[PDB]
């Protein structure tokens, strides 16, 4: 049984970071080694600031480097040295060309493998880390085998990471499971065998999963797309509700309290948002499209139709019940990221609401209690934000002579303003638009206050 | 009846100036001018280099040149003089307005004609030799009425010219056919035997067809349609051929031996080109929905769906077998002429497989042995998006150093004979080659030994 | 490896005549038509043939008897030969997937099954009929899933190119010989041992040798080239018809040009057979099960203009008759799918007529060869009770008629009495010619007093 000594990742980001950073923390005796081009960032990395924020990873960090976890741009010495490289490179979506806004750009990836082969000499395990499409891993065989040398034996792996933002450290300490995918060969067996054993240091052998390299890459798409359809599908029931006076909480909670269904992921939103949910369902979709697979291409498709439409009707709300024009009024945007407890804006709903009152000349006041300024007037950009957006430094500011509030995020602290003191200053009828459903239970007392209030998947009265 | 002895030429392009310098030199008692507004293509036509490349067109105007071949621009005296005009002005495709991509533009043949009747008195026969789209010549007819003097009298009728590029002199001296169409009257007769009689020094006259005015006008559409449904038919069947394992090669020549489909016009490729089929194509698509035939319109319009479509998918197959991504990747185009033996690139497949590749974000280094660096430029741009992506070798070998694939586009013979060997140590690996234009045929045991991968149009990819 | 003893398996139009053709040019073969139906072997062993073809009847008394031979007994047929031909039948499928385009495959299935249940030793195996592109691995699979010890079939495909009428023609100065097979030693042995056969009265350069998908591809791919240039023509002369044009002077100017050439080019109503519709279906289904619509879509256009052409002929029929021509007599000249020929399949006259069955017309048809019983049974589904006469002579279908409808290019025809005929028609009168068979006679029609209009002509 092959044991693994030394390993290098190359590709410094959310992915590879955290996850090698743990490896070091469980494994004492592996030498890890964290490679990236970007030089800033293998400088971050070894200095008091961490380049990413997880709770416990700062902690993790201190106590591994300079033992075993290393931190350098010597991308060519650690490949050398190592018996398994991560590949952990980013995937961004092409913005041009073929699949424009859906298929991944892999050009990273491929440079990283012409990379190692090139600095490669003996057995090494090659492993994907990153999220790539079905079948990569037979083009990062086919790159290693034109490029070949003496007694050079390359193997390739898949081992997806599941890390959500914000849990990375709970989630690579205690994963629901470890997925490890290689070929069916006594060659391919011994090298998962391998890897399972690094990751058997404090993992329970019960949850790792190895497979074949197929289904290990398709696993990881598969899984977000069946939690993104799990949020349209309660986004939909929540427009039914509207309809028919059903209120989508209640519902919500009968239909997870079937144990076939679970109740995780069925919080009706404005929409989904983030890095990760719509980007791998559009490259799951385009993956479908390449391979003649229209039927299977707009069952999922509709998972991001389901998404735009709630944020699109969320949108036309305000603007109806505004008296069909928002053009001047001042409105006020509570929450800008695409989650509470974060500063990330990524696809979050707040910029799509955002745009839609912009498109009808409204005049936002945006108040979020993370997101730098900065950062919310380049999500708005391209002029048009200099003339409508204002961004607020509390929420009572942003709330001053407006016509509605708009919560786009479910913060903790919007529960707790006082609304006494905003409706006073608001213009007449004031509106509250809810979309987190954050105001649940408040709805009485709003109104004898004198607001109108609607909210997600309850009818308005 | 009527002798021709003076010809005017309006129009010095393709149609006009290798025609009349042919039956000038046939035709030694007979007088031509050719006129024209471009002052540089006159001087160039009277220069020692012609401003259109042909096999034998030099050595035909040098014999006539002076003697009763003429080049001038003086457009209204050689009118007045002429027994017989030709009007042999450009008919481009619209860029704009009604029927955009796909109309003719009009425009020059109707100055044309009301230059003719303004400068014309007496018997003189007009004569369309440009393509022009059917009943063009009852329009030409309408205006001359329209403007009539005491003592006019204009026979119009239809010559298209068949000539093939980079076989010109050769398809003019020893032709088909001729074909001229005129009215079915008295004075329509005189008018097509008089221009018959001209034709009838040098080509046979089995070889001369007379029909009527509209049908000789629809047939230079028809005939050009049937050449370019070749070629999209043999292409469809190559897309069939790399599906199943057929060789597009084996079966174009099993079709061919079949003397009723004959053996020509049949060689796969990544697409037909050139400044006529697509142009001549479009044309009759256009005027068939002007006319209400729905159906014949879109039948024809397959033909330049199906070269579209081979173009769109070998950069497709390019992209695919280079593992699906082609960012900065070095990528070698050899060829850029729309066919061998000529700097021209007009509609070009290299233009569109280039700019499929560009859109990508691919690093091109383009080769052609005809075609002008700057041609390419111009070609490719709208500029930016051509300097950041866009380099010009001065060679092939500089080309394909350190690039991931070569991409043969244009047939030229010298890429059969290149050292592949030399191209694939300096290349990175995999290191690809995609013919798109099957010049490698036999070659593929010699390349795939060396190293390369070899993708060639109408055959199965090797695993 | 010489072949010594050939079975052909399927007498039909296909192995038939090749097969008496490969008897006569070669003493020293056996060569053996096998059958299941018994009527046909029989008929093939009598004075008079099942199938008719010039010269055919000659060939076949030189050499029954002494290496040709027309059996029953598929099996020891099968046994005792070298090579073995498939030349069974393959309808276009009337049920489930791919109904109306695809070949219905369970002929050649049975066949495949059939050899191998009896084949020792080395043995090659020939697709002669058309079959879909990729048959031949089929056939590799039932052989190689029923194997025995030391059994090696080697499949061939060697597509029949030979056009009714004129067969024994073709077979013997064929302008090619198609053999595909595989590009392994072992295939390219049992190519070179077909080839000999053919060399014994086909020149070397005329024996065209290529892969088995490229010969399977290669007989649709040529009948589909064909039915293109007659579309092609088509669709040009309604485009004349449009513009005074005229469609005989437009084919000719095409035709000229070598690179064309002059085949092929005649306008008509429409093509027919049951060879031209029925293969280019095949490869646009063939097309589509390959995901290429863009392919499909391109030969599909070949099919709807023949379909368009049909369409816009009747449809002109009924406009120049006021638009009505319920209880009108109407004459339909010609129901054969070209002249000189009894065979009906595809015919245009069959949808000519039921376009005008539509209207409630009173159709009186005249074919001087196709049986009276051919033509209910190709109108039928009542209707044609009550709609349709089959004349005896073509007088009879043109007394009393409103409209002479002229859908076969029968010689006769152009000599027909048309002042007698234009006495007893009711007027106005109309010629409506479908083949261009009256050109030359339009002013003395006219002077008479009929309207004609034909394919490819402006009305006058």
């Known amino acids: 049984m092959f044991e693994i000594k030394k390993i290098c990742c190359i590709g410094a980001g959310y992915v590879g970071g955290p996850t090698c950073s743990v ?13 990236d081009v ?10 008091p600031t961490l380049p990413i924020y997880e709770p416990g990873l700062k902690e993790v960090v201190e106590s591994c480097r300079g033992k075993n976890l290393f931190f350098s741009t010597n991308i060519d010495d650690a490949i050398k040295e190592a018996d398994l490289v991560f590949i952990s490179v980013n995937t961004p979506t092409k913005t041009y060309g073929m699949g424009k806004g859906r298929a991944a750009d892999l050009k990273y990836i491929e440079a990283c493998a012409r990379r190692i082969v090139q600095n490669s000499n003996g057995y090494k395990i090659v492993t994907e880390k990153s999220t790539v499409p079905v079948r990569m891993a037979e083009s990062i065989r086919r790159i290693f085998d ?3 040398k003496p007694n050079l034996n390359l193997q390739v792996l898949s081992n997806p990471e599941f890390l959500a933002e914000g849990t990375a450290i709970k989630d690579l300490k205690n994963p629901d499971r470890v997925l490890i995918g290689g070929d069916e060969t006594p060659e391919g067996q011994r090298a998962v065998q391998a890897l399972c054993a690094v990751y058997e240091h404090w993992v329970p052998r019960e949850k790792i999963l190895t497979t074949n390299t197929w289904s290990s890459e398709l696993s990881k798409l598969a899984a977000n797309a069946f939690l993104a359809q799990r949020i349209s599908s309660i986004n939909s029931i929540s427009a039914l509700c509207e309809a028919t006076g059903a209120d989508v909480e209640e519902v919500a909670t009968a239909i997870g309290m079937d144990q076939r269904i679970g109740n995780k992921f069925l919080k009706a939103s404005v929409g989904f948002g983030g890095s990760c949910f719509q980007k791998d369902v559009l490259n799951l979709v385009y993956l479908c499209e390449a391979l003649n697979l229209p039927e299977v291409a707009r069952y999922w498709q509709q998972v991001i139709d389901m998404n735009d439409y709630q944020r699109r009707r969320f ?7 505004l008296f069909n024009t928002v053009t001047d009024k001042k409105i006020a945007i509570l929450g800008f990221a695409f989650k509470k407890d974060t500063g990330d804006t990524r696809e979050s709903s707040s910029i799509y609401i955002s745009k839609y009152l912009m498109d009808e000349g409204a005049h936002l006041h945006i108040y979020d ?7 919310i007037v380049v999500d708005l950009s391209h002029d048009q934000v200099s003339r409508l957006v204002t961004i607020s430094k509390d929420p009572y500011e942003a709330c001053d002579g407006a016509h509605a509030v708009v919560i786009c995020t479910e913060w903790d602290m919007f529960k707790e303003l006082d609304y006494e003191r905003i409706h006073k200053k608001m213009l007449k009828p004031a509106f509250i638009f809810d979309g987190r459903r954050v105001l649940d239970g408040l709805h009485n007392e709003l109104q004898t206050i004198g607001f109108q209030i609607e909210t997600i998947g309850k009818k308005v009265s």
């Open 23 to 35: 490896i070091a923390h469980m494994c004492p005796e592996i030498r890890v080694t964290v490679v």
């Open 369 to 375: 209690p993370k997101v730098p300024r900065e950062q």
């Open 38 to 47: 970007n030089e800033s960032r293998i400088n971050a990395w070894n200095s």
């Open 146 to 148: 034109a490029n070949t």
């Open 315 to 321: 949108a036309s709300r305000i603007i109806d019940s």
